[PDB]
Design a protein around this ligand. Sequence first.
Ligand SMILES: Nc1ncnc2c1ncn2[C@@H]1O[C@H](COP(=O)(O)OP(=O)(O)O)[C@@H](O)[C@H]1O
Ligand SMILES: Nc1ncnc2c1ncn2[C@@H]1O[C@H](COP(=O)(O)OP(=O)(O)O)[C@@H](O)[C@H]1O
Ligand SMILES: Nc1ncnc2c1ncn2[C@@H]1O[C@H](COP(=O)(O)OP(=O)(O)O)[C@@H](O)[C@H]1O
Ligand SMILES: Nc1ncnc2c1ncn2[C@@H]1O[C@H](COP(=O)(O)OP(=O)(O)O)[C@@H](O)[C@H]1O
Ligand SMILES: [Mg+2]
Ligand SMILES: [Mg+2]
Ligand SMILES: [Mg+2]
Ligand SMILES: [Mg+2]
Lengths: 433, 447, 442, 443, 49
Amino acid sequence: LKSLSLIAAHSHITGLGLDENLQPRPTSEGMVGQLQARRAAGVILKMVQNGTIAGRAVLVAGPPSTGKTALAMGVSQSLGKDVPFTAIAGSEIFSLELSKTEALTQAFRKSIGIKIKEETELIEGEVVEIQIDRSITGGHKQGKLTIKTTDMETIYELGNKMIDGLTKEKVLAGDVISIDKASGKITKLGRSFAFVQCPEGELQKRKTVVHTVSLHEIDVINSRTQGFLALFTGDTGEIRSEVRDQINTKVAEWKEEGKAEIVPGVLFIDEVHMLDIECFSFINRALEDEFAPIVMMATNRGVSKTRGTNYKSPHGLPLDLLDRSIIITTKSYNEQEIKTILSIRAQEEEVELSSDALDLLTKTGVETSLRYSSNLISVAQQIAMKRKNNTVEVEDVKRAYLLFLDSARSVKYVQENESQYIDDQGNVQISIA
Amino acid sequence: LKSLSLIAAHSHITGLGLDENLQPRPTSEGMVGQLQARRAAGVILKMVQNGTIAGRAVLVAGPPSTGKTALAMGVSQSLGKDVPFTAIAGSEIFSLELSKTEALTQAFRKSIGIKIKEETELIEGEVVEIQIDRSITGGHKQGKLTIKTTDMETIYELGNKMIDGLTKEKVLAGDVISIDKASGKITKLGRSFARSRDYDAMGADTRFVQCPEGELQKRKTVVHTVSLHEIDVINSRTQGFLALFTGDTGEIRSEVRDQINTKVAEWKEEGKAEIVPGVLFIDEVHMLDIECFSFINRALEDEFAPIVMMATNRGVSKTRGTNYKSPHGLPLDLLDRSIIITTKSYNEQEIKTILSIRAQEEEVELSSDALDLLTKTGVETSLRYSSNLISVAQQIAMKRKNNTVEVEDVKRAYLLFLDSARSVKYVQENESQYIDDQGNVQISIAK
Amino acid sequence: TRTAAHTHIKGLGLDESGVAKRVEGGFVGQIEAREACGVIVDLIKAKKMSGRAILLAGGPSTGKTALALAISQELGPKVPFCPLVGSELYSVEVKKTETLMENFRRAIGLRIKETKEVYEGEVTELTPEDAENPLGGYGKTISHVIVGLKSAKGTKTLRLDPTIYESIQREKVSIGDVIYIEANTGAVKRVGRSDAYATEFDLETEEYVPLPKGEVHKKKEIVQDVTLHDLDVANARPQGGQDVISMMGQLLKPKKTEITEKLRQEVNKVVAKYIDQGVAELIPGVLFIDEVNMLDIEIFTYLNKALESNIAPVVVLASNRGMTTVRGTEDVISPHGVPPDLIDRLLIVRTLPYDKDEIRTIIERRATVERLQVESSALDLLATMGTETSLRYALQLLAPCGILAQTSNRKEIVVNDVNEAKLLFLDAKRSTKILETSANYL
Amino acid sequence: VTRTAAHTHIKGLGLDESGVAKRVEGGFVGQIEAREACGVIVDLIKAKKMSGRAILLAGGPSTGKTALALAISQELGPKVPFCPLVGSELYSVEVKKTETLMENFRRAIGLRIKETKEVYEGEVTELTPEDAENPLGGYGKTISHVIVGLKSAKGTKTLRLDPTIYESIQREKVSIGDVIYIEANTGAVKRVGRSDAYATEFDLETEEYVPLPKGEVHKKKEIVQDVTLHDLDVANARPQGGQDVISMMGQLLKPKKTEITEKLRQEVNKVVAKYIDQGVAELIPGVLFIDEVNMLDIEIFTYLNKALESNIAPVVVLASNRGMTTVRGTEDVISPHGVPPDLIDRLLIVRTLPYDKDEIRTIIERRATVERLQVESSALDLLATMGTETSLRYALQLLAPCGILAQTSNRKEIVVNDVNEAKLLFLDAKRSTKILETSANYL
Amino acid sequence: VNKLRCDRRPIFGKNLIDLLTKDRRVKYDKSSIIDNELIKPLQTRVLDN
Ligand SMILES: Nc1ncnc2c1ncn2[C@@H]1O[C@H](COP(=O)(O)OP(=O)(O)O)[C@@H](O)[C@H]1O
Ligand SMILES: Nc1ncnc2c1ncn2[C@@H]1O[C@H](COP(=O)(O)OP(=O)(O)O)[C@@H](O)[C@H]1O
Ligand SMILES: Nc1ncnc2c1ncn2[C@@H]1O[C@H](COP(=O)(O)OP(=O)(O)O)[C@@H](O)[C@H]1O
Ligand SMILES: Nc1ncnc2c1ncn2[C@@H]1O[C@H](COP(=O)(O)OP(=O)(O)O)[C@@H](O)[C@H]1O
Ligand SMILES: [Mg+2]
Ligand SMILES: [Mg+2]
Ligand SMILES: [Mg+2]
Ligand SMILES: [Mg+2]
């Protein structure tokens, strides 16, 4: 149900918070402000849910500490389960073992899922009697068992494999057991009287099971006989393109036959501002294939130099992708918006804040970065814990502020004491005298 | 004498010339001069022998051909055996298979040694005859065998598991075997001499041994000297013992390292194993990456950190991996947590004494005027340039078959082989003939 | 009894919920720094946050690593703590991102507690109990098996279900041999013959174990801990005796591979399932990185991405540089070599240089630790030297003075010994001056 | 018939018993000082006393540096190991350069091994297992011994073998009538084949036939095979024994170079020293030669200083041609011959002088005589003039096509018209550069 | 035979066969835990998939 969860940066964000008209609410689902950006994200989410288009690349922009990564996390949350979502960093593809093109291809393939469903009969009932006829140093053995439900009760004669199945795991009369006839798996639902009610209705019922596996797993499996281990150890290298083409044809014909359905997902790349020209050139052609997931790209850099080239390009990317990409911009944050963000962060961490404390935290997060206050809140609560009161006061926040330095203050102190610190040229002064 | 006796650059030096008061004699143990440096080396040696201190870095400084490598070799010789002493070069750590940090970690782990003692209870003795009642009762009828030594012999009763184990590795009596008291392991030592004449061609495993003497069973203790790095290598791999010889350790993870540290601490607390601090010496450390320097700075503050000594003949120059020039060729942070020992260039008297000791080392006798001329040449040239001239002059004298080396032979040797300055002058005078930096060169003499 | 620039730090030197004392736990001065460190210790002990990063910056020899050692000591051995260097991440075998992620996972720990009921003792006898079969038949039917257990200061006999016959036949244990039986799981495990039967044979390949002490029925609770990275590597690495992959691990070289995210998420899911039953208890750790100025810009970007994960533990960074350029970018200049975006994500803790009196106190405390005694005049001279050249030079010079005093058969160091040390051993400044004043390439 | 490649006309340094080099000897002319120095180095090598001594010889291109480095090896003799090397070959993909340099260093020094072995060989007349009737309690069923008779030309003999050798020969699948080979030391048994006496037994037969061996049955002999220490280290690191499936898989895998630890070399040194003390072996120092040392990196140059101070370091010689140049891997360090100053301090410098016009003419004459070609005096003088005009190697290379040109006209002598035609058909570096200066598209 | 026997004797294990197992020997007992169900090695994953 719930995986390993701890209070992180984007724990509070759960969904975009949009209406039926795709008009964002001022404060909903942990999202505050950024009305146009949220509306664009909702449009993209609706496009992904439609699933009738492919190869669409969207780049989000804005200064640091603006919420682009938060917007992507909200998009993932609103996307729900059953739809693949891959979030990777820019530097993740620089693999020493796998080619960068191969890593990008694997990332693209991982975003597309495939659903296959099948019907498996199930037999579940309460054990009445178990009888196993064996022979010491005799070889062949026999067995008989009686199963029971609320409505019906019969004796079943077991095969040779069933004897091993019921003997590998201890099975008694007081156990409630469901077994798949085709699969042969034996499951112990619970323990009856030696506290679970006996199964009702028919003893044997047929139920449908669906297996969801991303396409990249199919490529890895069919790449080599020993490639299945690479699905866990990650040790696969340079899968032949013919394998990918055959897999694409098989997937297309499966979708045509209706045996399986494909679920396009979203590939998210964080800090795309750093990458190589080879990666961009490969993406230019990879986005044009039929099985291209919708790609979201984030970049906080300005007009800088693309890695692998001497010249400086706008937005940190060459114009080739910018021609074929869609740009969503983000704006700064108002003081009231910062106050609401801090309040929602406190509510997420169940920390009680004084009104004056909240106002001064908002003012210092307006002067400094928002992340500074969003981090200082927990330390202020920890300090207030030492005073044996469950409420953060102005004095606690002031003590935390003077205890922990901001970037600008630290820069000023370093500049005032440049002799003490290590110079870029390597010179440093350590003697006090 | 156990090592190969080929004469190397540092062969005359043996130990240190210090006394019980740590006063260096002017000429002792094959070393001349450098009284302050020798006293510092003796202090460091006593520091290492104390063993209660660890994680200290000492620097050795001096111009080329001053005695830094000789001082390190003398320190190692004075330390003697049974104490690890790893001597590596700076450029050695650059490995394609292993990361530089892992190479430094392995070098540090090699320099620290460990002694482990083990006790065994063994019963070794020639067997007289084995009888088993396979027909009277059948199926481990509690057979009996007699074991004989040169001083004593008894009869033992054998159980079912004894018979089952003895069926494997069949014994036909008249053989010397050892049985384990704890696990009951059957080990065949060797046959007796009475079986030597049975055939004319023996098997590969066939061997003959004498009858063991003394008590039938003995309690003995064995002490092994294995350094840590071997322990980590063995623990890391299913068969790690081969990785020592092959050298493909495979970047051992730190988890195994901390497990080994905990095991060693537990053994030390139990008293089974004792720790023997060693010395790690890095030569020509002037060349190294800055990452290695930072890793050394961090790793010098660990409990299992052997004393590290480094040498460098470079002045204020550029450090590898950085554009800027640092003093002494090393970053200042490392220089902070270090002690620097400086060595001064030798004097003419010191040079001639060293030349005399080198000539005596090579079983070469020299004329007085020949020695004076060699010292005069080595004053203007370097000291290291004189030893090769000495060897060549001895070869020339042997060619002339006239006892000691004469001044004429030394002059001829100097004429035949040029010094660096003379070669530079000759190259500059004929710069057209040699290949220039731009690749341009002139071949034809005629213009 | 070995010390290396440390081991004289015992905790943070704080008090019971207040400002740290002037001298405590081998700490002198820098009250604000260790107060903040104690606040951080309380925060991690809360075990609620995730991905909280702090950074301390200051001049060389200002106790930057000492504070990290102190917080590591204060946390306790049970809490995981992984020291690391900036140069650690550059690995030939696998990309740097994988190594950083592996270290992150190794920082997080996990504790497992289990209770077991044990019935152990010497096997007095084994007697089946006969009863009438529910279904008519001429064959023998057994309803219970009677086993007697004998131990020191207590013996008992147990009546068990007859299904224990398979286990007792498998263990090949007959009579007068110590066995172990679990209450609910059943089954039996032979541990060795009773020591009283050792003399029954002249020779024996089988060890004899003494009878268990105390009652035959025991209730012991066992606690085991392991980090998440160990679970991941055990899941990924194959094990076995004769399956083909088993010696395919042999005749080859096992090397680090980029572990997939699906394996990590499966491990997380099973860990969550087990912890929902109360058997498990997750404890976050602390990751310590030194010389963070040496990290590549790509590693900085991946750190920025990873710090927002829901499982990322608390990391602590140290740097002794100021206005420098981040490695991998010739134009970007940021304080301490950390890119500005990463600095925006953490908290900066300042560190201040010490004074002459603090230096003297440090020297005297170190001398007490090193088990050697100095005079007041010698101590003052050493403090003046440390204030002149550097603190670390004075700290390193201690052992040579002890050795020199030992050579002179003296127990305490005098001014003459420290003078001999100063003339024999040089510091950085004199060496630099010699290099400047010499033209012999030295 | 006989092939010549810029060499093979040098049979040695050509020095008298007093060390004075003759004007013309062993395909060499001039360079008396260099030849005397090389002879001194040869004597030092044969002294087998010094270790790690290094010399370096420097000069312009085509000054005889490679010729001297080959003549010294020729004078040394095939017994003493001599491993030529080029500075570029050190950089290896599989292992670091330092490991390759150390491996070559250990390859340089050699060692000879003497051991005595006795062999029973001959045609198998009969074999007979002997089973003892006493169970003795210790075994169920085994053969006490096996009696095998061996026949050869000088006579016949019978043998008595323990069950291990019998099992080995049974595994060898040998019946009566097959020539076998028994080694007394290790008990090795190998089937040479069936004796030729049974060739006519069947009309056709897959098995080959071997003549009956000489010697009575049993022979005593010793082997004086000489093996360098690097082979010992490789064998220790890469064992060949074992019948395990894992061992076969390892044998199938390609042999990758690995950093042999210093501990293994120390153990090899210990056992070698023990054997040489016992007198069963003798150690012979070798010579390592590296050409174009300017191609080496600064790291290899630094490690050479540590390597040359080792105990078992052999004599190494170096060749270079550049003058004031920058060491590779550095930025501004300019040193003579592209060698760092410390290494130059550690070694000795030998200078090679250029050649006079008369010396060039004599070289051309000697080379032409080696190639078994007839050259007219006027044509030879013209060749000497044009070689002095451009280069000696140009004339040496042009000596070859002139023979084909003469053969085409069926004449057996080199004529001025032939060499002129060759010069027309083949251009030297200077003409190529001059025509390259004025051309449209890179010429 | 004397020479062969004398030469076949000085065959020394470089370190040991008992040192190896003595350093493998972990004093920590079996301490069976749920780690058997927590590890799920590669072969089990192949089998159940
Ligand atoms: N609308 C919002 N709702 C909640 N949190 C926000 C919002 N906008 C920004 N943030 C916070 O600002 C921080 C920085 O935003 P993010 O896009 O994740 O990284 P950056 O903008 O610094 O690249 C995040 O931790 C996020 O919690
Ligand atoms: N005290 C000494 N007595 C005799 N010879 C010495 C002494 N010190 C140095 N040498 C000589 O100096 C040489 C080593 O010089 P070294 O210190 O290696 O130069 P560098 O400083 O460039 O490393 C050796 O050949 C040795 O003979
Ligand atoms: N309060 C203190 N008490 C005692 N020793 C201290 C104290 N603060 C720092 N030190 C000394 O400073 C050293 C730590 O140096 P550090 O500042 O970590 O180096 P860097 O600046 O390179 O990280 C330790 O060896 C310790 O002995
Ligand atoms: N003194 C000489 N006598 C005969 N041939 C010589 C002499 N010097 C050089 N040569 C010839 O020059 C050719 C190439 O010279 P080489 O030594 O390779 O040039 P470098 O010195 O540039 O390596 C060799 O084939 C050799 O036969
Ligand atoms: Mg962001
Ligand atoms: Mg040296
Ligand atoms: Mg530090
Ligand atoms: Mg040449």
